[PDB]
């Protein structure tokens, strides 16, 4: 498998280059529950198409069986959308930049039940990123870890070997920024612990999207519905 032969400088470049584009929302401007959830659902749906393309370009991902690729994306897709969101929102303290023309704050998602809980969590994650001075190079490493890791224990050596490679790479980036050895493993740990929170946000988000599907007031797309159905949910 090609993934293990990459240097870490070569790894950073493949990841920086695999990055999906930043999509816009519908133009034309206050929001109501259903117009808001429409915009986000439409955006998420279009973002998913690019995510799959990005996933195929994460080193070692194509070396997996079709089925296992499917498993990983199904488990991780909302985590991956969410970490993208908090990364975009970094330079906008107080707001969530869903799309460049769709920059929302707390009071807005309050006009959906249970949304402000998730808004606050996402905003908190964004603060922490900003306080940590998270770098784009580090960010893309984190997002790849989510893709490969979140579904791995519901299946592996290859994957764990690829996970290791990315750890090396993350560390490689830290040694460059002039971090001492202690600083390196302290920031490595700090980064990875936020993945636990991102997971928590995804599961909260997933239940919420399931509320919506039971309400049938915001229509989910065929694809989004399949991603969602793979968590089975309801009260799982």
């Amino acid at each position: 498998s090609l993934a293990l032969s990459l240097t870490a400088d070569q790894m950073v470049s493949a990841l920086l280059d695999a990055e999906p584009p930043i999509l816009y929302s519908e133009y034309d401007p206050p929001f109501s529950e259903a117009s808001m959830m429409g915009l986000l659902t439409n955006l998420a749906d279009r973002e998913l198409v690019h995510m799959i393309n990005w996933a195929k370009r994460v080193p070692g991902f194509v070396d997996l069986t079709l089925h296992d690729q499917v498993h990983l994306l199904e488990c991780a897709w909302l985590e991956i959308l969410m970490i993208g969101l908090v990364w975009r929102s970094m330079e906008h303290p107080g707001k969530l930049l869903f799309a460049p023309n769709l920059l929302l704050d707390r009071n807005q998602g309050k006009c959906v039940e249970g949304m402000v809980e998730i808004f606050d969590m996402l905003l908190a994650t964004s603060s922490r990123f900003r306080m940590m001075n998270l770098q784009g190079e580090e960010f893309v490493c984190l997002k790849s870890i989510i893709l490969l890791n979140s579904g791995v224990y519901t299946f592996k050596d290859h994957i764990h070997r690829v996970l290791d490679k990315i750890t090396d790479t993350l560390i490689h980036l830290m040694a460059k920024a002039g971090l001492t050895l202690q600083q390196q493993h302290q920031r490595l740990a700090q980064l990875l612990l936020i993945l636990s929170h991102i997971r928590h946000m995804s599961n909260k988000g997933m239940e919420h999207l399931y509320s919506m599907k039971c309400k049938n007031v915001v229509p989910l797309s065929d694809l989004l519905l399949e991603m969602l159905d793979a968590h089975r949910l309801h009260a799982p």
């Binding site: 198409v49 195929k56 079709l66 690729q69 499917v70 994306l73 694809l223 399949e226 991603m227």
Partner: peptide, 9 residues
Amino acid sequence: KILHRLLQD
């Protein structure tokens, strides 16, 4: 699964 299509493509 739509997912299958999008991945093979």
